[PDB]
Amino acid sequence: MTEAALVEGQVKLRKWKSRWLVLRKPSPVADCLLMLVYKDKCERSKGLRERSSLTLEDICGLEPALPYEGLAHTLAIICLSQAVMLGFDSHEAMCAWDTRIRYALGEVHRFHVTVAPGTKLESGPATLHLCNDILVLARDIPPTVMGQWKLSDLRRYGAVPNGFIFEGGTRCGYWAGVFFLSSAEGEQMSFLFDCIVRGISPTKGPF
Amino acid sequence: EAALVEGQVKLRKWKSRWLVLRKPSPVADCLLMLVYKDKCERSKGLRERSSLTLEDICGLEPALPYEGLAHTLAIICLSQAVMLGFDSHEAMCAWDTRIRYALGEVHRFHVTVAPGTKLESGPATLHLCNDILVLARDIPPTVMGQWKLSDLRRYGAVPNGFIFEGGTRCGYWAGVFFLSSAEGEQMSFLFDCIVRGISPTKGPF
């Protein structure tokens, strides 16, 4: 019997090195991803023990098509600690990986936003990530986490004209307070928020 | 505000209260208990009387006689066991069926533990709960041994039983353990699937 994968294929990793990559959830209810790296597809076909393994246990979000180290079809697995950059040839393979990994991890969504000046947060373009029970803001390539909240620690939030406002409570020490984002998807963000905090997946219904 | 299950349930004297059960996270091993006064104070929209979350769930045990009630379900955690009282065997089965599926891969096997190890001999129940494996006893159930599945070296079905060896990582629970059962081959297949990322029912995770 062979070890299953949510996705597998030829991918570049970090210079760049090409290797056959296997991604799978370590457990049926995992926020984590197990990375299984083989030299080639044959080593995997012949079901030999992988060259290297790694478990990403602090994933904050996914973000495809960021330019990085000479490549354009890259995927970022954003983590509290580090970002893991995946290298693909084709655009559609990258999207396939992004779409498959997203669904598998539960509720993982991203919105391109502009962070308003005035708060502890750095202003300018950024991407807001909802990863199940956690909210994250991410910037730059490779993406780094600049703000993090448990959704359960937010007092208030809501859509506004050309934006979205959320407030972190006492629970989130120095991340407490009111924060302002510009985007055309505030209604989508607020509805996503409304659903999750009540245990509904917008797509799957109740968890 | 959604529920994986709700209905009239007795909880601990027995207090019959409209119970709402749901996951707090779409992919996490937790149950949020929402205790409402009745179906009215819930179907209306009022805030619950009390709430509790259980974040170390390691199994489910239905059909237990407990404090006067024939049909009680135990939600077993590493820390404690939560007892739920029902009226009919069916209503409780419904709750067992619905919770097991919702929490991912949670399985129970009524076994006989053989003497010779740090475990206590006699009838018990092995519980597999996604990442973890557990042996539970009595009413209310208590955990009498625990392992991460990743920390197991070997396992297998044997004529009329099951065996699994724990790695050094396990500490006090390292070593080979023996279980008597008619569901050994079924047990081996489940372990085979899980350690390889396969749900026997749902396929790949």
């Binding site: 959704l151 359960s152 620690d153 937010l154 007092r155 208030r156 939030y157 809501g158 406002i165 407030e167 409570g169 607020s190 928020f193 409304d194 905090v197 009540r198 | 505000e1 707090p24 805030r47 709430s51």
Partner: peptide, 9 residues
């Protein structure tokens, strides 16, 4: 702005 049902607990 919406209050959060999770927060009251």
């Amino acid at each position: 702005l919406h209050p959060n049902p999770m927060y009251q607990r």
